[PDB]
Symmetry: C2
Subunit: 271 residues, 2 copies
């Protein structure tokens, strides 16, 4: 299973992660769908970025193959602590961070609590602002295992449905039913789900204080997070650029891979 990588103790949690490349460190933080993992999210991103940077992609506690501690208290702050724990464990003093959706909210929160540890940020279809729950996100977080339910989620995630094959739905369905995966997932974001969008968000006031050069990315047709949310982040963060990809969903790094990798690498190259 290529989704399983290296193992390291971080913030007291045995963490699964990938580490490829040399040089300036870049932390990639995945989304929050069923069966999600750092590899599943970043398999097409790591190869490109690792040619110029040291890329670290961990499975956040509660997701992927990282340990799911008994009675663990999941929260925006606990996840931020995990990210910092991972950085501390790897002697990463300061790094750029690419946060995808769920991960984007965590990236913002980390930059706010540990400003000295974050350099540049890339926020893709990111959590971070309070936006009305979408049917897309409610469906994603309300997932129940089945190849048909997974196919529907994959359809929700991408613009070009021709990319959603029976094989992909099958493979992601299988990933979603691995031991303990669905159990922790279904209990992670229970109804009413607006609560978690709000809990993962940061205040307009706080976001305005971010001094980091930031690149906000969003797919025009994103069904999970409305473009309006990223437009808002683009107005709040001072040193920000906003790039909207037409004919693209909530899976920008996979749907517009080459354009995405190019934009991100050049963005970090400026530093």
């Amino acid at each position: 299973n290529l989704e399983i990588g290296k193992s390291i103790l971080a913030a007291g949690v045995l963490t699964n992660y990938h580490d490829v490349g040399e040089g300036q460190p870049v932390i990639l933080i995945h989304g929050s769908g069923p069966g999600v993992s750092a590899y599943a999210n970043w398999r097409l991103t790591i190869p490109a970025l690792s040619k110029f940077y040291r890329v670290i992609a961990p499975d956040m506690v509660g997701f992927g193959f990282t340990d799911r501690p008994e009675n663990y208290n999941y929260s925006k702050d606990s996840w931020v602590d995990h990210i910092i724990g991972i950085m501390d464990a790897l002697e990463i003093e300061k790094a750029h961070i690419v946060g995808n959706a769920f991960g984007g909210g965590l990236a913002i929160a980390t930059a706010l609590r540990y400003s000295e540890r974050v350099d540049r940020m890339v926020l893709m279809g990111a959590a971070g602002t309070r936006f009305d729950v979408t049917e897309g996100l409610n469906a994603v977080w309300g997932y129940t295992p089945s190849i048909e339910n997974m196919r529907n989620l994959l359809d929700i995630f991408a613009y070009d449905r021709s990319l959603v094959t029976d094989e992909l739905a099958r493979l992601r369905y299988e990933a979603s039913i691995q031991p303990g995966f669905q159990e922790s997932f279904s209990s992670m974001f229970p109804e009413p789900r607006q609560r978690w969008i709000d809990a993962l968000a940061s205040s307009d006031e706080d976001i305005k204080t971010l001094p980091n050069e930031t690149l906000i990315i969003h797919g025009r047709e994103d069904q999970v997070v409305p473009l309006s949310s990223s437009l808002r982040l683009g107005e709040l963060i001072d040193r920000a650029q906003l790039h909207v990809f037409g004919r693209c969903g909530h899976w920008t790094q996979i749907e517009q891979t080459d354009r995405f990798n190019r934009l991100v690498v050049e963005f970090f190259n400026e530093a």
Copy 2:
């Protein structure tokens, strides 16, 4: 005067233009401020793009050093005819087009009337949609010569006012009072100016038919054209990408030169 380049008869008008580089043709179309010219608009863009493309930057009839025919009938359609005349005169069968503001509206109109002649488009703080006249545009089109009035316009155009020096204001003021310049300019967009924003715009219906890969660029702080206009173009044009530069005004190619040139060259490189 570096603003004066080569001369060619196009659409029956003696036209001043610049032509640098080899390969795929790219037409750069300037904005509509007082004293504007292809060189003034594109001096920092041509050098970069000409390394990979053949860059053609003409002074549109009524502007710069191109002839201002007696009793000439200026209109969106006449300007489109000039662009096509320039392309015909240079045996340019198909080309990419970069339209800045005024030029962006002309680029859209050209792509609609001569679809077979336009490949990819870059629209920066572009005309093309009906948006309520801004004080910025009304001030630009309502310019009366003076170093103070020019300084105010330069301030309106850029985000970083530290770039607006006494020398720059002086030089652009001088450009605005060249023989016949102010006379044709003041009679070009008379009050009520909303009429010209509307005349230069294309219908939502027509814009939706554009099949061209398009890159829409806008400075977050643009005081002349509201970001909302470019957001609209980003929703209407199917194969579009929208890139918003924070800490940037209506002069993106000059305010964020390296980022701009990089994005544009890579955009054309995809073709």
